């Protein structure tokens, strides 16, 4: 049973707690142990806080990293934006000496040092790796087939891009996340421009809601045209956009889709037999009941 510190940023615990609950339960069912991070905070959200000040972005991400450093554990994440912040600041401060120095003399005011000893992983990346739980182990753990459901994957942008800074391979047409959805028994479908941004990154969600919603609506149109019955995602930002933004699209525009948006951990819980009440699917703006009728 591999053990990881569970970073747990802002949106999953405070808006979609079923995501974190299913994360812990399903990760324990497969051979992974997710340990609470002691006093972790907002990973300085890369858009809304990196746009303001890169130095304080570095300092806060480094503080989050040195918490798990003192814990002597590897970070595990469930958010693409949190992955950007944590993993990328870890990578930058493992190689840039003057930035290490600057962050360290900022952190020395709170009796705290960064040395760069741990690694950062996304939970879906762990589920895909073969040393850690693999696709076959996921298939083994699945107990409810979830058959006869068309499911559209949204990769997001901060997990895989830029490919010159990550290690997940092709960004033009990846299929790895489609294999994790196929392990659950749901057939993943392909839609036009599947690698498009959801529109919520960089603080655009806050600065220009209509612009962000138009970017989201382009995706929703493509997904409905494909014929999806739900949208899996690996990011609480993207889930919030696809969930709230459907309501804001219904009100600001006149478009109705009613497409449930679920984190992959929530689908994994559904596959492994967790209850909809135990997943808190009532906390989503868009009702999941048609999808539950199909897969149950």
């Amino acid at each position: 049973m591999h053990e990881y510190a569970f970073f747990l940023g802002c949106i999953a615990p405070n808006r979609y707690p079923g995501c974190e609950a299913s994360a812990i339960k399903t990760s324990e069912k497969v051979g992974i142990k997710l340990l609470p991070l002691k006093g972790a905070s907002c990973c300085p959200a890369p858009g809304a806080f990196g746009s303001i000040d890169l130095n304080v972005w570095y300092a806060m991400a480094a503080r989050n990293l040195v918490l798990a450093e003192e814990m002597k554990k590897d970070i595990a994440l469930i958010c693409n934006g949190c992955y950007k912040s944590i993993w990328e600041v870890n990578h930058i401060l493992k190689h840039n000496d003057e930035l290490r120095d600057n962050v360290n003399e900022v952190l020395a005011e709170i009796d705290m040092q960064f040395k760069g000893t741990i690694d950062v992983w996304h939970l879906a990346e762990l589920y895909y790796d073969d040393k850690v739980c693999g696709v076959q182990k996921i298939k083994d753990s699945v107990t409810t087939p979830l058959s006869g459901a068309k499911v559209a994957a949204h990769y997001g942008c901060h997990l895989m891009k830029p490919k010159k800074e990550r290690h997940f391979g092709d960004t033009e047409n990846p299929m790895w996340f489609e294999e994790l959805i196929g392990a659950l028994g749901a057939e993943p479908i392909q839609y036009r421009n599947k690698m498009q941004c959801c529109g919520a990154g960089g603080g655009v969600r806050g600065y220009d809601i209509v612009h962000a919603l138009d970017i989201t609506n382009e995706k929703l149109i493509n997904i409905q045209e494909a014929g999806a019955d739900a949208i899996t995602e690996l990011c609480p930002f993207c889930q919030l956009q696809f969930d709230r933004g459907q309501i804001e699209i219904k009100e600001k525009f006149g478009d109705v889709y009613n497409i449930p948006v679920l984190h992959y951990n929530e689908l994994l819980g559904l596959a492994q037999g967790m209850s909809p009440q135990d997943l808190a699917l009532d906390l989503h703006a868009i009702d999941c009941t048609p999808f539950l009728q199909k897969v149950l």
Binding site: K164, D170, T171, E172, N173, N193
Partner: protein, 662 residues
Amino acid sequence: PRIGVFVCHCGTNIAGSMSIDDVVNYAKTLPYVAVADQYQYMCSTPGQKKIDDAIKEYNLTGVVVAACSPRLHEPTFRTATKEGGLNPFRFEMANIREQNSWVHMHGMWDEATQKAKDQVRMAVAKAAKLEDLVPKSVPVEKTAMVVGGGVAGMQAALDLASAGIKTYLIERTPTIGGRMSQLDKTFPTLDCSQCILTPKMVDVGRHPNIEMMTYTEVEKVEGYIGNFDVTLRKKARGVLTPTEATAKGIVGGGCNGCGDCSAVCPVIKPNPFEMGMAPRKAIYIYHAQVMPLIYTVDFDSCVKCGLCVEACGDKKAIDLEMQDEFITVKVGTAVLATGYELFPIENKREWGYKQFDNVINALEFERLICASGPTGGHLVRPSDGKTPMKVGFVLCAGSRDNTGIGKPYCSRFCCMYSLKHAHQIMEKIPGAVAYLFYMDIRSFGKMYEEFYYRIQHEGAKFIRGRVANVLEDKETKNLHVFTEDTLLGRPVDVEVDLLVLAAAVQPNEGANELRKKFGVSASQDGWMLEAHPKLNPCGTTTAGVFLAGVCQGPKDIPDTVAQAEGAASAASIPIHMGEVELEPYFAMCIDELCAGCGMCVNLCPYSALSLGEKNGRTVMVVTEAKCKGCGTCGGFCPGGAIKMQHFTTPQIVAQIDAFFAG
């Protein structure tokens, strides 16, 4: 010994960094120095006259010139030393310009003067110990080899043969011609490529002075400028030419190219000439215009069914049990003309080359548009066989790219061939529109700008924007090309029926292996390197090897042919003379110091060293022709039994001692 020291000013390039007067007075007070003197331009005719007059007047044993680099002006001053009654090799330079002045210009003058005095002292110390050498002259075999049967190889072979030298033309493939045989029409004159080349292919095939050896490779090369012992692998063609059949005893003949064999062969495989678009049997020719019309057998795919031999009948040209024969050929010079291949553009995933059906590259487009290709010359969509009406051309596909996937250089001809293809589609399909997504149209050659003007006049759309990514419509299989029109200032989404990628070119497959066999180095770009990038673009640093064609860097057919004839001329220079002088830097074994340990023998890359019998004692023997003067053996030998002719241990140690003299 009596040494003369002549210090050049180089026209203030040296006098503006040091005190030439002080250097000269120090040279006068140096030991062994008979005369020290200075001049503004020692490389000029008054400078050589000054050297010669000094030699005659002062009875000089050796000459030291404190001037520019030896790599610049050894030949000049060696010839000046010869003219004057000395050996050319009683001369030594002291580089006090490119290693003293130009690097110690600013704010440091007496330091540069002291450095110059030190360099002059070391040069005088070496020259007081130099002694006479005579360059070795070696005979040159009157044959030549041309590796590559493309336009550059064929032109070089024809040029050498018509100059009268017997020539070998080695081609790995069963036919000569190269890429130009695959081209359909040629920019900017729009001539048919096969029509203009078939004449020259016939000349090569008929020339009595050319030994055309197709379907053959170069296993190994040893030797030097004089004699290159080149071993060739005659791959098992499986079919006998009439000459070989008569030699083996079949009077009725060999292969006449009737085609019955391929009419009955049941195996069907892709044709590499048609870039895989077209079928060909196990026994086959690339196209109907191949020069040796001899019908290779593909032994990796033949099932030995024996139908081909029954079809061939009394001609008995097919020998299904043939094996790779090896031949050793002695040649005087060699010309390398290996050409190029298209860079693998499936690595650029944003342009769905392998993943979308209707995305092709420019050689596949050229085969599709040729009238002798898999189609009847009709461009049709690979996805469904329908005629396109909008065609996009992605220029710079994998080129001028610093991301590590593509090539950082320009492929030279891809702007021109994309213009040609746009013209061809707009004239062959009525109402079809060509869109060129370009980033610097490069029509630099003769009539190229006029060709560009004419294409725009016929109505190709030029969108200045590098393509960002390509999406495939799920149903119509049409391709959505996304970029920005940089001049218009807006993003664009052009939906085309067919997308053509003007991919970069790279050195052919196996070219690095062949150039390592011949001893040629590579450029920064990965192409074969030339002797001097400006004034010697054909010859290489290894003597007797010359470059021709795209193998030295991408070029159009005109530039390729000019380069090929230049290489043929350079390869003919030593063959016509019949003599060639080697540089007397060889290793010479001092036998009554050699102990016969044999340990130096394995330190020679060229196998110039061996153990032999002289006066009962087993001593080492140098093949002075094979030695190249590196000095590895002579730097090894513990007993000092190997002497390096112009860089002897006493000379080098005298230089060290003079440096530490104060």
